[PDB]
Design an enzyme around this catalytic site. Structure first.
Site, PDB file in Angstrom:
ATOM      1  N   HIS A 164      66.321  47.393 -91.775  1.00 35.79           N
ATOM      2  CA  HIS A 164      67.731  47.426 -92.149  1.00 35.79           C
ATOM      3  C   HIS A 164      68.484  46.234 -91.553  1.00 35.79           C
ATOM      4  O   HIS A 164      68.187  45.825 -90.427  1.00 35.79           O
ATOM      5  CB  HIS A 164      68.372  48.744 -91.699  1.00 35.79           C
ATOM      6  CG  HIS A 164      67.834  49.956 -92.400  1.00 35.79           C
ATOM      7  ND1 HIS A 164      67.908  51.213 -91.828  1.00 35.79           N
ATOM      8  CD2 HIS A 164      67.232  50.064 -93.607  1.00 35.79           C
ATOM      9  CE1 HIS A 164      67.349  52.040 -92.693  1.00 35.79           C
ATOM     10  NE2 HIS A 164      66.929  51.395 -93.782  1.00 35.79           N
ATOM     11  N   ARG A 167      72.907  63.497 -76.002  1.00 39.44           N
ATOM     12  CA  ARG A 167      72.492  64.628 -75.173  1.00 39.44           C
ATOM     13  C   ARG A 167      73.641  65.111 -74.299  1.00 39.44           C
ATOM     14  O   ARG A 167      73.951  66.302 -74.300  1.00 39.44           O
ATOM     15  CB  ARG A 167      71.264  64.262 -74.316  1.00 39.44           C
ATOM     16  CG  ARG A 167      70.017  65.002 -74.760  1.00 39.44           C
ATOM     17  CD  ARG A 167      68.771  64.647 -73.972  1.00 39.44           C
ATOM     18  NE  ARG A 167      67.675  65.553 -74.327  1.00 39.44           N
ATOM     19  CZ  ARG A 167      66.709  65.270 -75.196  1.00 39.44           C
ATOM     20  NH1 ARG A 167      66.657  64.078 -75.776  1.00 39.44           N
ATOM     21  NH2 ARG A 167      65.768  66.164 -75.466  1.00 39.44           N
ATOM     22  N   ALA A 193      76.844  64.624 -74.749  1.00 37.94           N
ATOM     23  CA  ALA A 193      77.982  65.077 -75.560  1.00 37.94           C
ATOM     24  C   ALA A 193      77.835  66.517 -76.106  1.00 37.94           C
ATOM     25  O   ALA A 193      78.770  67.039 -76.710  1.00 37.94           O
ATOM     26  CB  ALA A 193      78.223  64.116 -76.711  1.00 37.94           C
ATOM     27  N   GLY A 194      76.672  67.132 -75.918  1.00 42.38           N
ATOM     28  CA  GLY A 194      76.437  68.501 -76.355  1.00 42.38           C
ATOM     29  C   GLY A 194      75.616  68.663 -77.615  1.00 42.38           C
ATOM     30  O   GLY A 194      75.424  69.789 -78.071  1.00 42.38           O
ATOM     31  N   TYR A 213      72.216  68.678 -80.145  1.00 45.06           N
ATOM     32  CA  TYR A 213      70.842  69.161 -80.048  1.00 45.06           C
ATOM     33  C   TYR A 213      69.945  67.980 -80.394  1.00 45.06           C
ATOM     34  O   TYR A 213      69.806  67.612 -81.561  1.00 45.06           O
ATOM     35  CB  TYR A 213      70.605  70.362 -80.984  1.00 45.06           C
ATOM     36  CG  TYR A 213      71.404  71.584 -80.578  1.00 45.06           C
ATOM     37  CD1 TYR A 213      72.743  71.711 -80.919  1.00 45.06           C
ATOM     38  CD2 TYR A 213      70.827  72.597 -79.825  1.00 45.06           C
ATOM     39  CE1 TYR A 213      73.484  72.821 -80.537  1.00 45.06           C
ATOM     40  CE2 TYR A 213      71.557  73.714 -79.436  1.00 45.06           C
ATOM     41  CZ  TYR A 213      72.885  73.826 -79.800  1.00 45.06           C
ATOM     42  OH  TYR A 213      73.621  74.919 -79.392  1.00 45.06           O
ATOM     43  N   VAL A 214      69.419  67.324 -79.363  1.00 43.02           N
ATOM     44  CA  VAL A 214      68.605  66.127 -79.505  1.00 43.02           C
ATOM     45  C   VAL A 214      67.125  66.449 -79.225  1.00 43.02           C
ATOM     46  O   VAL A 214      66.800  66.936 -78.147  1.00 43.02           O
ATOM     47  CB  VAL A 214      69.148  65.007 -78.564  1.00 43.02           C
ATOM     48  CG1 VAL A 214      68.379  63.709 -78.748  1.00 43.02           C
ATOM     49  CG2 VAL A 214      70.644  64.774 -78.768  1.00 43.02           C
ATOM     50  N   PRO A 215      66.208  66.183 -80.169  1.00 41.64           N
ATOM     51  CA  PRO A 215      64.781  66.452 -79.902  1.00 41.64           C
ATOM     52  C   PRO A 215      64.146  65.427 -78.955  1.00 41.64           C
ATOM     53  O   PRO A 215      64.765  64.420 -78.629  1.00 41.64           O
ATOM     54  CB  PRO A 215      64.151  66.394 -81.299  1.00 41.64           C
ATOM     55  CG  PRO A 215      65.011  65.436 -82.042  1.00 41.64           C
ATOM     56  CD  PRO A 215      66.414  65.605 -81.510  1.00 41.64           C
TER      57      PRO A 215
END
Ligand SMILES: CC(C)(COP(=O)(O)OP(=O)(O)OC[C@H]1O[C@@H](n2cnc3c(N)ncnc32)[C@H](O)[C@@H]1OP(=O)(O)O)[C@@H](O)C(=O)NCCC(=O)NCCSC(=O)C[C@@](O)(CC(=O)O)C(=O)O
Ligand SMILES: CC(C)(COP(=O)(O)OP(=O)(O)OC[C@H]1O[C@@H](n2cnc3c(N)ncnc32)[C@H](O)[C@@H]1OP(=O)(O)O)[C@@H](O)C(=O)NCCC(=O)NCCSC(=O)C[C@@](O)(CC(=O)O)C(=O)O
Lengths: 616, 616, 78
Positions: free
Chosen positions: B272, B292, B294-295, B297-299
């Site tokens: 890109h 993470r 900031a709240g 849901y990060v894998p």
């Protein structure tokens, strides 16, 4: 081997042009992994030539012969004939095939063959050590090796019933449809049939059930025999006698249909020609009882036939008589496009659009209107042209102006280019169509085909605000003739009454003639210079048609612009003048005219010098 | 609603003639049970007109306009434009669409659009309360309602990912291909997406991810937000700031790709245009850490994205926030014929066979022989005719006899029927092809086309044992002229040297001339009666061609019989004489010849009387 | 395009044509005659091939035609 009827090396002729049966045979050969087709040639009494068919997805050619001896001489390896001749010719064609030294088996499909003819075919077959399967049968098949015509139906049915690989069951029936049902029953309750034959339902067959049962008894590949008979005749008593004489040692499953007969009247003749118990012995009860007493495995009713097959097969499997084999790979075949299209599986875009007529329904439509309604409403030839060319139901006076133009331009003597060329082609002995097209191909800018350009140029001059004198002046400066102006014989001294007739009609019936009025002003100026520069018939038609379209209310400004740009109006002269061209062609044929050759005295031959052809 | 981008009532224009994208949109509308297509018109800058496409299995017409203002004025209900213009015109076409009061959303597909142009499009969109999705994107889609062009690929993929019905997930990505992968991931780990948008990978997009995320936050149908970003630029920091300011209350799954970057050199520019971390803040690590904190849901990696989706969805399902719904009926669509044919699913028979040439391969074949080999071997025009007409590689002297005939019959002056008609059509201002066909259509039994009949009649007389005198006598009794005998100008007094030239060649090169010898005996008898009854050039060609075929060894008796019966030889005169016809047409054009009209003094006008036309 | 362009180069360079002669050839349209003459060989071949094959009458398949008749309203006015 004497016991083998067909194998994977069997080659056959198909008597009769039965394209579906031919394809079914080839499809079976393909799914059975045969190296070459089971059909050597087609016998088509009406035509010799070629037939194109599929080998999987690939197209192949099969030769087509007019007679049985010609095909046999070309393909001596073919020993089977699948006979699709009608009941009117089944006997003579089977007898002809039986007389050929190279043909050994004939399958007779025809229903309605006399009992005497079948008796003679059966005796001829027995005398020559040949086999007749039928009449009134689908045939039969050797699983994984060969199929007679339509036997076992669709490739889907062949796959579902595992008929692409042999089993251990030797099957024989009277009924053709029940032979296919039995293939399904047997495949679900054993390892399937090895071979299956339907002898037909006639009371005197070409081969009896026992003939085939005796072959199954000799074949080591077959460990189980199964048969389905019916009431009437004494065929099944040959099996029971062979069973009693210990001629059949393999376990035999047997069922005779027609148990309904004693419950119904004695006069009832059933479907098959031979299905009528004349005596008590001929009944299903007497046959099933004699079968039971002879040692055969007879079920309680047809419902438990598969269960009896399952019982006999399981017995052979436990005892080791029959061995379990690994299922071969399931064969595949492409679906016919027509089937995938009918079931809605696929879609295919059209290449063309047609908006003017539709011949594909119950009734022909001209621009959506039924031909019946066109005729009931007396729309006439002008109304048909309104629909087919303009997609309009025109006002009556507009349809009558089209018809008036056709009559006015029908002919203008034999001297014009188109009539002259059509006469020369007719004098050269040409047919009407060639002579007509020879003359129509002269229609262009100088002769006839000036209508579109007259409409175009006069409309432009009048629309862009040019005064008639400015239009005449502008065209002269560009070196361009005004289309629709000028004539070879008509002039101020010799007026064209055709132009007068078109002008009187438009003045009496058109709401306005503004472009005509402008054109007549241009004509005053051109004729003032040279008398032959009149508004000719082509200019008159083009200009008046613009006034007609502009004033009839049926056309928008855009529609009129499209008509002018695309060139519709020369079609009127081609159509009208075709009447006179055909007339001139016919006149020369009636006159017995000789070939024309243009006189030499009318040609100045002026060859270039040697010097001229050598350089520039 | 301000939060809704597309619904089931959305109407769109497709800018650019992208027939596959048009079909994909219509197929989605059909499987989503829309009442009418989502496309009002196509904008084709090259052409206005119509485009035919499918609505299931039914063909429909879509109007095509040359410009955006013309289409917008015709279909004011269309508020979306799917822009397939190249990067060279994407800006001006998007800006033109944005200036239209009725267009609200523009999807820009083009890759390679300048960053400045995208900045101006984004600012123009924000100022006018409009939306720009792209540049460099597939678009996006509202499940069960509308799709932008090619978004979500095949109907098979749409069905497998259940995109014909909405779910509870609001999705947004940078990547177009990953938007389709995400649709699959989300469908397997939740009730699927409600809406999904790919903003493109350019560092200055028309719309940022947060613009779409804020719409999902207002939409009550969406209970879950999911997004997939990448390194480079600060777009994701708008989301993290909104997450910190409690502007996004719905649970948000987030993953930023580009974790590979610190392991690789700093100079690496990724796929890109905007995928290059200039600062530490721009890296995937800094973005995923800020997400993470900031709240969100990060894998752990992209591998556990679907698992995080499954965890967040399951949480909503247990808590009652999201409700389980019954799966609607699976929609169906017919497969395109071309796909079923390519995969081998179907077969379709050909209507025609062609045995003389093949243009479908890497090189043109004439009767199986490559054009290159025809030319390298110097087979010549005669050798090409041997291949295309006879399917033979002829001996050299046979190919040279064909070429000799063409030269000998090329022209015989302007007076003959064919040349005369071609001259009249040329004088009438006709084009070369029309004039040529006008003259070729005179070729028949009296002029030129006597070759086939001469070959037929002389071969029959000589074969059936008729003496030349008996043949002459028999034809006279039947009232039939002998074809190939007689001439308008050539005779005993004026011999035809063309006939002499053909005869000398055959005597010098043919192994035998038996039919010629017989024909010359017939000529002695006919000329004894009338001097003009010579063996003419047509009779000479037909007879010599039979001797050529009989003696060259290349033809069997059957092949010769087929050639005679079908009529090949008149083709030689049509082909040869076309040279002189074209010459005569061109001669009249160079001479500036005027329109011809046959002189009246050469016509006897003999009209029937009134009495004659009234009865018989 | 290849034949037309090469024929101009042939006429321009062979020495047998003046600039005027070349202009006349271009203006009057000689070169399409070459394709009509040449392609007549293959046309006659295709005609004969169908006669040898015993081909039947062709009728274009209905499934390749979209019949789209105008409405009664369309044929009554503009
Ligand atoms: C009709 C004809 C070819 C005649 O040609 P000619 O060969 O006699 O004349 P040309 O050699 O061209 O010239 C002579 C001198 O008058 C000048 N001059 C001629 N036409 C002029 C003009 N249109 N505009 C200005 N000026 C003109 C010219 O500039 C020169 O003057 P100048 O320069 O001073 O030396 C010619 O007029 C022409 O092409 N017209 C336009 C095409 C047209 O509308 N065709 C339809 C005719 S209806 C038809 O086809 C149906 C028919 O009625 C036919 C039938 O019965 O025959 C039937 O039903 O079958
Ligand atoms: C050539 C012509 C039409 C001439 O006709 P005419 O109109 O002059 O004669 P007709 O009115 O038929 O009769 C006159 C009297 O002689 C008798 N008589 C005539 N032909 C007779 C005959 N074949 N067999 C017996 N008897 C005959 C007849 O029975 C009557 O005698 P009688 O009854 O006693 O009063 C005529 O012969 C004819 O049809 N031939 C057969 C067809 C044929 O082979 N065509 C090819 C000619 S090469 C060609 O096309 C190429 C060309 O060379 C052309 C060119 O340059 O011109 C070029 O390269 O362009």
């Amino acid at each position: 081997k004497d016991y083998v009827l067909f194998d994977i090396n069997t080659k056959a002729f198909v008597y009769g042009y039965q394209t579906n049966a031919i394809q079914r045979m080839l499809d079976f050969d393909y799914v059975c992994k045969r190296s070459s087709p089971s059909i050597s040639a087609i016998i088509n009494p009406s035509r010799a030539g070629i037939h194109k068919a599929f080998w999987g997805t690939k197209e192949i050619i099969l030769p087509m012969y007019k007679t049985i001896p010609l095909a046999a001489l070309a393909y001596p390896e073919a020993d089977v004939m699948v006979n699709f001749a009608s009941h009117r010719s089944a006997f003579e064609t089977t007898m002809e095939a039986l007389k050929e030294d190279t043909i050994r088996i004939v399958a007779v499909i025809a229903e309605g063959v006399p009992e005497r003819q079948s008796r003679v075919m059966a005796a001829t077959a027995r005398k020559l050590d040949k086999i007749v399967i039928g009449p009134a049968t689908v045939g039969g098949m050797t699983a994984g090796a060969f199929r007679i015509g339509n036997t076992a139906g669709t490739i889907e049915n062949i796959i579902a019933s595992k008929l692409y690989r042999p089993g251990c069951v030797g099957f024989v029936s009277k009924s053709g449809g029940m032979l296919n049902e039995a293939f399904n029953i047997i495949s679900r309750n054993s390892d399937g049939i090895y071979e299956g034959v339907a002898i037909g339902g006639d009371r005197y067959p070409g081969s009896n059930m026992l003939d085939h049962i005796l072959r199954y008894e000799r074949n080591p590949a077959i460990k189980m025999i199964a048969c389905l008979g019916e009431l009437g005749g004494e065929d099944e008593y040959m099996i029971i006698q062979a069973l009693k004489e210990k001629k059949i040692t393999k376990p035999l499953v047997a069922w005779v249909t027609g148990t309904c007969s004693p419950y119904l009247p004695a006069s009832v003749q059933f479907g098959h020609a031979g299905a009528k118990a004349n005596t008590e012995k001929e009944t299903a009860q007497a046959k099933n009882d004699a079968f039971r007493q002879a040692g055969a495995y007879v079920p309680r009713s047809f419902d438990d036939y598969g269960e009896m097959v399952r019982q006999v097969y399981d017995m052979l499997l436990t005892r080791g008589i029959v061995q379990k084999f690994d299922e071969p790979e399931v064969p595949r075949i492409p679906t016919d496009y027509s089937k995938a299209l009918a079931t809605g599986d696929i879609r295919k875009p059209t290449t063309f659009i047609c908006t003017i007529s539709d011949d594909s329904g119950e009734e022909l439509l001209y621009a959506g209107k039924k031909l019946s309604d066109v005729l009931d409403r007396k729309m006439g030839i002008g109304g048909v042209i309104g629909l087919l060319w303009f997609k309009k139901e025109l006002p009556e006076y507009a349809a009558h102006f089209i018809e008036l133009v056709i009559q006015i331009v029908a002919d203008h003597g034999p001297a014009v280019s188109g009539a002259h060329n059509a006469i020369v082609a007719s004098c050269a002995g040409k047919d009407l169509i060639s002579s007509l097209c020879s003359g129509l191909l002269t229609i262009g800018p100088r002769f006839g085909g000036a209508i579109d350009d007259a409409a175009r140029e006069f409309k432009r001059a009048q629309e862009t605000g040019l005064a008639p004198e400015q239009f005449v002046g502008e065209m002269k400066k560009k070196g361009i003739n005004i289309p629709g102006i000028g004539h070879k014989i008509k002039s101020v001294k010799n007026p064209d009454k055709r132009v007068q007739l078109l002008i009187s009609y438009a003045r009496a019936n058109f709401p306005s003639t503004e472009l005509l009025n402008y054109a007549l002003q241009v004509e005053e100026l051109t004729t003032a210079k040279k008398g032959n520069l009149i508004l000719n018939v082509a200019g008159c038609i083009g200009i008046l048609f613009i006034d007609l379209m502009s004033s009839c209310g049926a056309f928008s400004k855009e529609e009129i612009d499209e008509v002018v740009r695309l060139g519709y109006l020369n079609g009127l002269f081609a159509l009208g003048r075709s009447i006179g061209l055909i007339g001139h062609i016919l006149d020369q044929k009636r006159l017995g005219s000789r070939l024309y050759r243009h006189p030499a005295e009318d040609i100045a031959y002026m060859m270039p010098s040697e010097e001229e052809i050598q350089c520039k």
